[PDB]
Design a protein around this ligand. Sequence first.
Ligand code: B12
Ligand code: Z97
Ligand code: 5AD
Lengths: 110, 728
Amino acid sequence: DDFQQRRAHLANLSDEELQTRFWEMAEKIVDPLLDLGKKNTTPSIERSVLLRMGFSSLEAKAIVDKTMDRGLMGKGAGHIVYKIAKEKNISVREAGLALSEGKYWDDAIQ
Amino acid sequence: LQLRVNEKLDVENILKDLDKYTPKRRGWTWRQPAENLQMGPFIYKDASTPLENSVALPSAKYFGDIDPQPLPVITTEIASGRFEDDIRRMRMAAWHGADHIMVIRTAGQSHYDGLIEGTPQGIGGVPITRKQVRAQRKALDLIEEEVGRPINYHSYVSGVAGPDIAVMFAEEGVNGAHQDPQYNVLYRNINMIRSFIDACESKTIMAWADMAQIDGAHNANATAREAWKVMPELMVQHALNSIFSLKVGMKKSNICLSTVPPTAPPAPSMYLDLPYAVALREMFEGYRMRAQMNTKYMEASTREATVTHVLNLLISKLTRADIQSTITPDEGRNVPWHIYNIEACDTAKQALIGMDGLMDMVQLKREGVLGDTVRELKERAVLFMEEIIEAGGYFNAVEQGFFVDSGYYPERNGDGIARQINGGIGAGTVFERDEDYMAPVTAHFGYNNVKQYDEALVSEPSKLIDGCTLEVPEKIVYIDELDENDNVNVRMEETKEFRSMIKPEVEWQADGTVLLTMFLPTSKRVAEFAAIEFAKKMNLEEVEVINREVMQEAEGTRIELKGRVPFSIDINSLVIPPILSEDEIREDIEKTPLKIVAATVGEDEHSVGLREVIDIKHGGIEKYGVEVHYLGTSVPVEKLVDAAIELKADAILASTIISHDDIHYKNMKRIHELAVEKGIRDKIMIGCGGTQVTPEVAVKQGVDAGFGRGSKGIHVATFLVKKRREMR
Ligand code: B12
Ligand SMILES: Cc1ncc(COP(=O)(O)O)c(/C=N/CCC[C@H](N)C(=O)O)c1O
Ligand SMILES: C[C@H]1O[C@@H](n2cnc3c(N)ncnc32)[C@@H](O)[C@@H]1O
């Protein structure tokens, strides 16, 4: 206190002002954090997509590891597996197993 | 299908067919309210629906074994490294009131950059896999069918692979979980950027599964030099995680604050902690309160721990708790034992029911010191928010050591934990979503360009692949084992032997551990080593002292020890002999009224003992409504015999204290002899007793029943209605 001269500007706020100010700022703080989650991704977000598409944890590490090596993370690991499945006219499953073993990364870079 | 009250859980059979196992249901469940619920003689104002099967508190025997349940979900932490032993503990606690079973993860699971599989052994927790989760939920589906109330199953989503676990948890029907971006950054030094980008997806998957979410703030208690100074930080952390989770789509009513009262006696803990609790609950109206118990200010005394948990419960009762979690009383002493989880649940249930409707009689003086402090705390936390903003945001504030600082905010001691934005586990694994980024599944948080493949599918991005595992559960890949020696299967062949003998355990089958409590008339150190010796001299193995309290430096020392027992015992080679109640006795002497004549026979002046079994003071025949016509001491052979007649009595009762020349066993004779020699000895009973008297050398004197050193009124009255339900 310090504290005394710190709190001075809150001195006259009512509990409601004080509480809504508490939350107003909390929200100001987290907004740049939530906005990072909209605009970006990670190995685990991408693996978590692959789990939902029907691949094992083992197969998901395999695909994303390789996806990072091809600088393709920004397109989406699942999007990769899906586009290839379409193009080479196979199944989401086939294309994945395929990709997790090194096949088709060539074709995907275009 | 399966599960009968008297047949153990077939743990063997539960592990079968796990590949074909589906969760019986999804999401979190609260408890049912029971307005004015009647149980036995009592009305309850704060109770929930009772259980179909359970184990009532010990002193429930004095009220028809009623087992009333409070309104808050009661938690219990079960996770010993071998989940398959744990299952058995879950069924125990479940019956004792727990409906929220929380499985702590094996040490360091946060750092696992992916799911793991199968059933490796854990340390300080259970390794969290799809198999092991399927097992426990499958088992619980049974235990909740049995007890008759749904149990919420709970583990952790924390670490660098939250999205992963969150997918599997949502799939396998886990009901609740921790997830706090801040937890990963402050305590596991996971990189702050990637921690938060990840939590968006984690929390969205948990929003889908309707899971309860508990936050991490209770970790700030653990890490604080003094806990009674950390409150402004707690508030900030509870707030940043909540407003973050809300905006991700999580329901305001699924967002729980992990809130432990910061202190314990000898600190004036109610005084210190009550305003924070009130403040937090006012400031966080709308969110759920997940009250946890003290673990910081705790030691080896389980009595001390229990006393502080009740004051912990008092804080919850004086404010509110949606979830009331528990801590085992032996927590500061050893990894939790079976018996102490049941102490935890018993304690919680008993204190809450003991406080039933307390708030119709007690209320907070909200204006006074209480109200002022509530204010001040709100203000300190608002300041804390402001400095975070002035310093450029959350990341900046973490870079600057705002957190984990031993100061009382706005005090800053400069000893908090600084994480680097570009540093930490998972540093540099953050990728920017490209304009054509896409993700073909349910419950994805961030930018998702579906409209490139099909405008109409934007609200069901999962259709692109005719459903993801959240829609189509057969698309899930099950994995049984990866190690081949480190699995549940091995571990359980390891002791098929005991599953027809038996030995003690504390956590794992036949672990042989048991607890020894003793007092020794010497200094604490000496006696500590003295105890270990008696312990080995008692054939105990792996002996170690687990608690030591001074009674007084010179006079003695309390010592508690654990040790292993190096041998079993056959249930089969045990010899075991195959209850006339309080109410059964009082009621006989009503349908058929009863009367007695009692005296101290011989030249015996000792009146104490005879009086001991008559005076109601110590539950003597008087209590049961027997008519007693006492004659005094020195009463002669016949005056007692004559009396039963002269008074029309259904029994004579006499005592002998003095014993020289066997004068005691003797007198019982001339009493039986002068009971037949007159002619009363077949429509009357005759009982006697004394210091020196055995009920055996008494039947061998003609008198009907004997009573020796230590006979209470219960023993007499029980006999007096029995030898009368034979003749009469
Ligand atoms: C204090 C005491 C006295 C008191 C008696 C108190 C009183 N006014 O009632 C007075 C009265 C102070 C006393 C006198 C003497 N007594 Co004295 N008395 C004791 C002493 C220490 C107390 C025992 C007692 O109160 N019992 C407590 C109750 C709870 O136990 P209890 O009497 O055995 O009864 C229990 C059971 O017997 C049972 N029970 C008993 N009777 C009955 C009857 C029925 C129907 C049922 C169902 C159950 C039942 O239930 C009771 C509770 O569980 C005992 C020693 C002892 N521990 O035995 C002697 C003792 C019995 N008396 C003893 C002696 C020697 C004497 C004296 C001769 C000593 C002297 N002055 O020289 C004198 C004279 C005796 C006399 N005048 O009759 C000796 C006995 C010698 C012997 N075995 O023959 C004793 C054993 C002490 C001793 N070792 O010296 N003493
Ligand atoms: C939010 C969070 N994430 C992960 C972990 C630990 O998990 P790992 O080792 O980092 O994988 C913890 C543990 N601390 C709490 C223990 C029990 C407590 N008393 C309870 O209430 O929960 C945690 O709190
Ligand atoms: C040491 C550990 O690594 C795992 N693990 C992952 N893949 C394999 C594998 N192909 N063979 C054996 N163990 C494996 C575990 O599940 C385990 O117990």
